[PDB]
Design a protein that fits this description.
The structure is cut from a larger assembly and holds two copies of chain A, two copies of chain C (177 residues), one copy of chain D (380 residues) and four copies of chain E (164 residues).
Chain A: H1 33-40
Chain D: H1 46-55, H2 71-79, H3 84-92, H4 96-101, H5 107-117, H6 126-149, H7 152-157, H8 177-184, H9 192-195, H10 216-219, H11 227-230, H12 234-237, H13 259-280, H14 296-299, H15 348-368
Helix pairs in contact in D: 2-3, 5-6, 13-15
Chain E: H1 4-15, H2 21-32, H3 34-45, H4 48-62, H5 76-99, H6 103-110, H7 113-119, H8 125-136, H9 148-163
Helix pairs in contact in E: 1-2, 3-5, 3-9, 4-5, 4-8, 5-6, 8-9
Classes of the chains: A mainly alpha (46), C mainly alpha (177), D mainly alpha (380), E mainly alpha (164).
The complex binds phycoerythrobilin (PEB) (12 copies).
Chain lengths: 46, 76, 177, 380, 164, 177, 164, 164, 164
């Protein structure tokens, strides 16, 4: 019973894996400036 | 130098007034969408292309140079 | 409304802090350059009557349909009213340069300006340039590089005040953009 | 018993300002009471005359060629037999007033302007608007200006020497009427020529049609939308410049919204206000770890008292005493300072604040999704 | 707020005039009187917890009836919410010295205090016996300079005049 | 605004009915229980000042971020207004209990009170909590079952009037939600 | 509507006060009189078709010029349109005998009552003659009791003066 | 002076109506409600000295810090001024009984009272300590009749809500 | 007259306040900037015959058309009223440097000045050709000091801007 539970396994935890998915250091899903703009389709001229 | 100030949740970069706040990117960079193009402060527009002009007469060149007499006030 | 001294009070209030050692030092350099600020406001209120006709008439020569019939600056009462909002805007930017903070621009100069231009029919693209020309005039008077009027100051630079007054002339140029 | 008399009643004999104005938005902005003193300098007869032309004309541009209509009753004020309540009666009965706010105005728009100008108050209910229409149809324009001013409300509020001001009364008799006047005085940089469309409807700025929006909210008792109370408002001209944690100002309606990001945000507030209902119930009994031992740690708390401060030698060593009220409990300076950091440290207040920013973002993201057919979209 | 700058820009904007020389003259007096009152604000920032602690138990030593059951000092929770109020008033006086005039004490510390102290039954003499104690503890060359002690004890007496 | 006795009239004219022995029965029983309603409305107005401090401060202890720098009952200005909007709602509720009709309430406070707090930035469901505590205090006083105060009455059942005053207090909840 | 209760919760609402002991007593007055005047309502609604029958001809027992050509009683169906009106005004008496005050009279029978009468050739001299033969024909021990009879005799004289 | 009669003929004056039968509704209840409240009038007016004596030391037992040097009871001729102040309030209570409204209390005793006591350094909590005490030494079937004591104990905490 | 001591008293009376530490701090600026505008006020009090002369003909050198018939400066009796007017403006600038604000120039020389010069056909471009000549004639180490040639030049183009 809470609102913001801490993440971790073992004793003294809340039931949430580390980093919310067992991924402490997650990989970058975002892409470069030049291709995140070309993907949106409104930074065409820029 | 450029000024960025968000007051009353109205973020404007110079004369921009951001419409779309944040778009996270690859190398921890941020992208904002602005409604105008920001011109640099000390920007002078490059002039249109022109044809080179040359002095028609050389005597008219000398006719516009003041002499030492005119510089002293002894002549008209 | 706020000035530079009370803006750092309401940011220290956001942290329940006393205005202490590291926050009282930036205000002691606001008064250490307090005479250049008074010397810079005086450059603008001196030439103010010719600042708003150098700009409004410089807008007519670029967009000449403003005085064409049906235009926004067409009659005498329409041209008269454009010169009164020309100097109201310069009057509020002078208070922001004096106070050191753009609160008066947000609280009462721009509080409804974009909506009142659309409700009247003022072309907002031309009224940027009436504010953008006054920015070129004011940074010429503060750095003392006006090409037809020079005023007498002590030696030093006012590069920082000329940059700050540029920030108020395009907070107005973006809050109606 | 908080307030003792409203502003609709006359002031009592023992105050300078009314009580309801003392903690209202009256103290925070330019909408205050300017009074004419007993003997007036000609320079400070302009300070009372510029304030009248602000209010009674509603930030209009009185040019020099059209201020020459008013010099006959200007001078009758500058001499001093026309009080401020009698100057505004003749100014309303003028010609430059009837051209601006009467001769192109629908009868709803003329009454609600007279409510803004003569009184400091947007129209309250509908049968008040109806009875003020029924004067003009039976008695003409002339006696209808005596309806606003020659009743009890002008004498009790403004007297005869205060210029009219937009009242921030505190107590509003419907609570809808606090937004009716907030939409009517809509901006420091606004004027009724713009808000009524009286420059775009006519020719070269003249021949304007002074038409009103929000007519149906008078007849059908319907609230004003919240955007018209927070965007151009008297609450920005009287902005408190606080650190409000729900910041009330509305963000600009963005271009490029998408129905995906509205659906994550809409679900997000349902996770938060369901959590708020189950966290507010849990608190207030078992929230505190050191509370069940407080009655046991307090029973044995007092022993080996001390009068002259500095006893408890503990084997003949110094070891004094504080004897203060705070430190007798064992508290420090950080014992009262913890109440200042409970904005986000707490769990009941972290939920509520994070809920209120989400319905702030949701109220403008939804309303931007009201424009449909030729919409060019994005990839976030 | 109420400052030197805000009074000369709101009286100007009521008239419709640019900043004239009568306005820039008064902002020069903000420059001479600055370092006196920016010297008492820094003395209050670094020594407030020893001032508030000493100003707070003066309230309870003078009125020991407050610690009875029934009054505004009946438990440790209300006592901590007493020393905090002194630290609120002391922090606003530090904000008044930085701004220049009585801006923060009016809008944040006075405007409504006559109502919230009547409703919650907080005695206001207990508030002013804490502020008057600190005004009388000021040893004007030791604590700060002599002109800072004028600027410090001016807002201290402004507050006692507003609560009494 | 309307009453109980006007309410049969504002329904009967839509059929234009002579109100003979048709629907008077809830009105002869209305004035029959007039004294035990007057004995019930006096219970609230004798304790109304100590109700709204009990209720506003009780809202604070459940949400203590309201008095930290940022919260919407922080300063003395924000506390004195919130203590006043508790007094306005308890005053219209005592009017609705006095006439036995709700149409003094929703046309004089609840019309537009939701859109007001969205404009001012007052958090909604903490203000729901303060009306909720006042609901729990009114049904205690009417049944004479408050913990720390008792008033003497002629003995009789008053659980029906306590349901009526509770039926108005959640109409405030349906407004500002 | 102008009832006993609507004044008291608005004579306090204008002052912004709570119901006081003067306020609750004003509804105690709307109990003892309220019996004998709510008693005055069902007797009206019982034989309501006869008090308009005895007034539907006394209005014509004064004036025979109403039945002249061109006039308002010039035919039969507008006498029935007249009967619908005299049906209404005693029915509004039935409404204000249960409210306690004169609410539905000046909200539904007095508002605009002049500017339709003179406009549409409706002379009030025969309207009050219909209500006159209502009034003094009332036999106070046959129709009702004594103290119940004054409450009926008061209300119809309120629109005697209001309609002329 | 706010009475029952005063608040109905003032609202009649706001419209311009005559004394209505709606306005005769209220004063009929005034005659029955004055069987109670006029009985408690002379019960106060024959025994007011013994009431105000008991309330005085009830104030001074709870707040015995008032007899400290410098406070609001430091000599006998300040205590004597106190014992007549609570006899002023008991005298206005006797006036509100025979008038029947809040009028004689919120004009002669309440309006401005928070301004005088905040300047004369009088703690207003000592005032309710003698009013809440004499609120509840009234035992109902011995002091008066049962209905007089419910009007006695209603003006008394109109006072306590005002000053607190 | 508009000055520092009038505007901080008129503002502190609009609210009904005692003079505060932001009202006093303004008048401390009236002390620092008085030693520069008083030696630009006496510097004009002695030499004022030579400055009305040197600037009164600067217009007539510029606007040589003014002495044609029908015009303003057509004859010597109108030229003498013209040299009197530049004396009038120089006297008020001497008044303004004494008070500290532009109260004299406003109340005596500016207020109503557009109503007359349009009526009497006076070209205000000639009036500003005099005042602008006096402005740039100044040699700021020679004529007066540096910060006195700030104060003298400030009121000189406030008059230009109020005529332009
Ligand atoms: C930048 C805008 C200029 C420039 C400005 C400088 N001004 C400097 C000193 C200065 N200016 C004034 C007058 C000002 N103070 C007042 O109180 C009033 C009116 C009430 C005014 C107009 C004063 C008094 C001073 C101080 C020196 C003096 O005159 O005694 C200044 C010197 C640095 C400093 O004082 O901190 C600078 C650099 N100079 C420039 O080069 C650009 C063009
Ligand atoms: C102790 C020496 C005092 C005393 C203090 C109490 N104050 C209580 C509540 C309270 N105080 C204030 C005003 C305060 N809050 C502010 O934010 C500022 C200025 C920025 C000030 C001066 C407020 C608004 C409140 C209510 C909310 C809160 O709890 O903070 C209090 C609790 C009373 C109760 O819970 O019934 C106490 C005990 N009491 C004393 O005896 C002396 C006067
Ligand atoms: C004793 C239990 C009290 C207390 C009483 C004191 N009151 C003092 C002065 C005072 N009291 C009133 C109000 C009173 N006079 C009226 O005419 C009416 C109603 C019609 C009332 C309620 C006034 C107006 C004054 C000032 C004028 C005067 O002295 O008569 C007083 C003297 C204090 C002083 O003058 O310094 C005392 C001691 N004080 C207490 O400690 C408890 C609360
Ligand atoms: C500095 C080298 C200047 C410069 C100065 C000269 N001024 C000359 C004469 C002159 N100056 C004034 C104005 C003087 N009187 C005042 O009351 C004030 C301030 C209010 C000032 C500055 C006057 C009125 C006159 C004419 C009469 C007189 O001499 O006193 C002057 C002699 C030339 C001449 O008289 O025509 C010089 C050299 N000249 C310069 O080139 C730089 C800018
Ligand atoms: C001039 C640079 C513009 C332009 C301006 C026009 N404005 C007209 C009316 C008008 N303008 C304002 C703006 C002004 N008033 C303020 O209070 C503030 C901020 C403090 C500002 C910036 C207002 C309020 C109004 C309405 C005035 C009224 O009610 O009469 C206007 C038309 C006037 C008329 O129709 O009589 C014009 C032409 N137009 C332009 O083309 C340039 C770009
Ligand atoms: C208290 C339990 C709340 C809370 C309240 C605040 N309300 C503030 C201003 C305000 N409050 C109302 C409500 C009330 N006044 C009325 O007149 C009527 C109906 C006729 C009602 C229900 C209104 C209308 C207003 C605005 C009017 C004005 O300000 O004059 C307020 C101050 C906000 C500010 O100063 O910006 C507060 C703090 N806030 C809370 O946190 C609790 C939940
Ligand atoms: C079509 C018509 C037309 C005009 C009217 C001018 C208007 C004008 N002036 C400036 C630029 C400027 N304008 C002024 C204004 C003035 N100079 C003074 O000293 C006086 C006080 C005031 C004239 C009354 C100043 C000071 C500058 C800066 C450079 C300088 O003049 O020294 C600029 C910006 C730079 C540029 O775009 O060239 C413009 C558009 N230009 C035009 O093309
Ligand atoms: C914000 C401003 C500010 C203050 C005014 C002081 C207030 C103050 N003074 C003293 C402490 C003291 N203050 C004094 C001064 C005096 N004692 C006398 O008898 C003379 C009348 C008077 C000289 C003017 C002395 C002698 C002490 C040390 C002894 C003591 O504590 O009483 C202390 C105890 C801690 C300390 O030593 O500093 C504090 C909090 N501190 C502050 O931060
Ligand atoms: C002007 C102010 C004014 C009032 C306040 C009332 C006062 C009042 N209440 C009751 C009388 C009563 N009041 C109650 C009410 C209650 N008893 C309970 O056990 C419950 C706790 C509570 C209801 C919630 C009951 C049950 C009676 C008696 C029965 C009845 O009246 O029908 C009576 C009739 C008995 C008597 O003669 O005293 C009166 C006059 N009338 C007034 O004129
Ligand atoms: C964190 C701080 C905090 C508070 C301030 C209180 C606030 C409070 N009081 C009550 C509940 C109540 N509150 C009152 C109010 C009062 N009682 C009286 O007799 C007086 C007239 C008046 C105080 C002056 C009453 C009458 C009840 C009903 C029960 C009773 O007290 O007999 C409730 C609802 C029931 C509950 O949830 O417990 C709450 C939240 N509780 C808290 O946790
Ligand atoms: C709502 C209240 C109400 C009433 C008061 C009566 C009014 C009334 N009375 C009578 C009818 C009558 N009323 C009376 C009584 C009297 N005639 C007199 O002239 C004496 C003054 C008085 C003696 C006491 C008599 C004798 C009749 C029979 C015919 C007549 O005289 O009118 C009629 C004619 C139709 C009928 O019989 O009903 C009516 C409408 N009906 C009502 O519905
Ligand atoms: C205290 C401030 C103050 C002033 C400045 C003057 C302003 C002023 N000047 C004139 C009056 C005049 N002013 C001029 C002025 C000029 N003629 C020219 O060729 C140039 C345009 C210009 C000066 C070089 C002339 C010629 C007259 C006389 C015009 C006339 O009477 O028709 C008048 C009309 C009354 C009169 O003739 O005296 C007034 C009020 N008066 C004042 O009280």
């Amino acid at each position: 019973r809470t609102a913001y539970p801490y993440t971790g396994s073992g004793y003294g935890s809340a039931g949430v894996p580390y980093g919310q998915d067992t991924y402490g250091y997650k990989a970058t899903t975002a892409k470069s400036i030049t291709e995140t703009a070309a993907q949106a389709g409104v930074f065409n001229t820029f | 130098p450029i000024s960025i100030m968000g007051l009353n949740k109205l973020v404007t970069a110079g004369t921009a007034k951001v419409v779309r706040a944040d778009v996270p990117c690859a190398n921890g960079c941020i992208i904002h969408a602005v409604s105008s193009v920001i011109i640099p402060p000390n920007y002078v527009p490059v002039p249109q292309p022109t044809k080179p002009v040359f002095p028609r007469s050389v005597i008219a060149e000398i006719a516009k140079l003041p002499t030492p007499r005119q510089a002293l006030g002894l002549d008209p | 409304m706020l000035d530079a001294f009370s803006r750092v009070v309401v940011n220290s209030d956001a942290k329940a802090a006393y205005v202490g050692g590291s926050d009282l030092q930036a205000l002691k350099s606001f008064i250490a350059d307090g005479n250049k600020r008074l010397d810079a406001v005086n450059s603008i209120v001196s030439n103010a009557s010719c600042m708003v006709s150098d700009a409004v008439s410089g807008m007519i020569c670029e967009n000449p349909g403003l005085i064409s019939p049906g235009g926004n600056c067409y009659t005498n009462r329409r041209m008269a009213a454009c010169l009164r909002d020309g100097e109201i805007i310069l009057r509020y930017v002078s208070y922001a340069l004096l106070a050191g903070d753009a609160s008066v621009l947000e609280d009462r100069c721009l509080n409804g300006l974009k909506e009142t231009y659309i409700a009247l029919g003022v072309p907002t693209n031309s009224s940027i340039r009436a504010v953008s020309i006054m920015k070129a005039q004011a940074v010429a008077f503060i750095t003392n590089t006006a090409t037809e009027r020079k005023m007498s100051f002590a030696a030093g630079d006012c590069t920082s005040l000329a940059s700050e007054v540029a920030s108020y002339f395009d907070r107005v140029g973006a809050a109606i953009s | 018993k908080v307030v003792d008399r409203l502003d609709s009643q006359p002031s009592a004999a023992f105050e300078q300002t009314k009580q309801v104005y003392t903690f209202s938005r009256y103290i925070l902005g330019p909408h205050r009471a300017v009074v004419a003193p007993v003997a007036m300098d000609p320079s400070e007869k302009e300070v009372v005359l510029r304030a009248v032309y602000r209010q009674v004309f509603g930030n209009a541009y009185i040019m020099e060629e059209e201020r020459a209509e008013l010099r006959v009753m200007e001078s009758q004020f500058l001499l001093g037999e026309l009080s401020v309540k009698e100057l505004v009666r003749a100014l309303a009965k003028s010609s430059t007033y009837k051209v601006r706010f009467f001769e192109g105005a629908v009868q709803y728009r003329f009454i609600e302007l007279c409510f803004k100008h003569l009184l400091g108050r947007a129209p309250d209910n509908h049968e008040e608007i109806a009875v003020h229409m029924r004067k003009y149809q039976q008695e003409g324009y002339d006696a209808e200006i005596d309806s606003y001013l020659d009743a009890g409300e002008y004498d009790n509020v403004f007297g005869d020497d205060t210029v009219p001001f937009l009242r921030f009364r505190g107590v509003y008799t419907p609570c809808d009427s606090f937004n009716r006047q907030c939409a009517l005085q809509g901006g420091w940089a606004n004027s009724d020529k713009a808000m009524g469309g009286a420059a775009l409807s006519g020719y070269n700025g003249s021949d304007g049609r002074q038409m009103s929006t929000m007519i149906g909210n008078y007849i059908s008792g319907k609230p004003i939308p919240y955007e018209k109370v927070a965007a151009d408002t008297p609450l920005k001209s009287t902005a408190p410049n606080w650190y409000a944690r729900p910041n009330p100002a509305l963000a600009p309606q963005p271009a490029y919204v998408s129905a995906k990001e509205i659906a994550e945000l809409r679900s997000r507030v349902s996770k938060l206000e369901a959590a708020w209902s189950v966290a507010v119930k849990q608190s207030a009994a078992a929230k505190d770890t050191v509370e069940t031992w407080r009655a046991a740690a307090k029973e044995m708390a007092a022993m080996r008292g001390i009068s002259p401060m500095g006893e408890a030698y503990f084997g003949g060593i110094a070891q004094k005493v504080d004897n203060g009220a705070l430190a007798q409990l064992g508290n420090k300076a950080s014992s009262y300072k913890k109440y200042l950091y409970a904005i986000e440290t707490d769990e009941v207040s972290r939920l509520e604040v994070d809920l209120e920013e989400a319905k702030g973002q949701l109220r403008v993201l939804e309303a931007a999704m009201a424009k449909s057919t030729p919409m060019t979209r994005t990839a976030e | 707020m109420k400052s030197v700058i805000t009074t000369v820009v709101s009286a100007a904007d009521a008239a419709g005039r640019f900043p004239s020389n009568s306005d820039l003259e008064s902002i020069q007096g903000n420059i001479q009187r600055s370092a006196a009152r920016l010297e008492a604000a820094e003395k209050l920032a670094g020594n407030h917890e020893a001032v508030v602690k000493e100003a707070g138990d003066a309230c309870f030593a003078k009125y020991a009836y407050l610690k009875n059951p029934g009054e505004a000092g009946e438990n440790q929770e209300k006592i901590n919410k007493c020393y905090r109020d002194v630290d609120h008033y002391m922090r606003l006086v530090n904000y008044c010295l930085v701004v220049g005039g009585t801006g923060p004490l009016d809008e944040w510390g006075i405007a409504g205090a006559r109502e919230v102290y009547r409703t919650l039954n907080l005695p206001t003499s207990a508030y002013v016996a804490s502020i008057a104690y600190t005004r009388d503890r000021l040893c004007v060359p030791r604590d700060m300079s002599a002109q800072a002690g004028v600027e410090f004890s001016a807002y201290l007496d402004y507050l006692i005049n507003a609560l009494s």
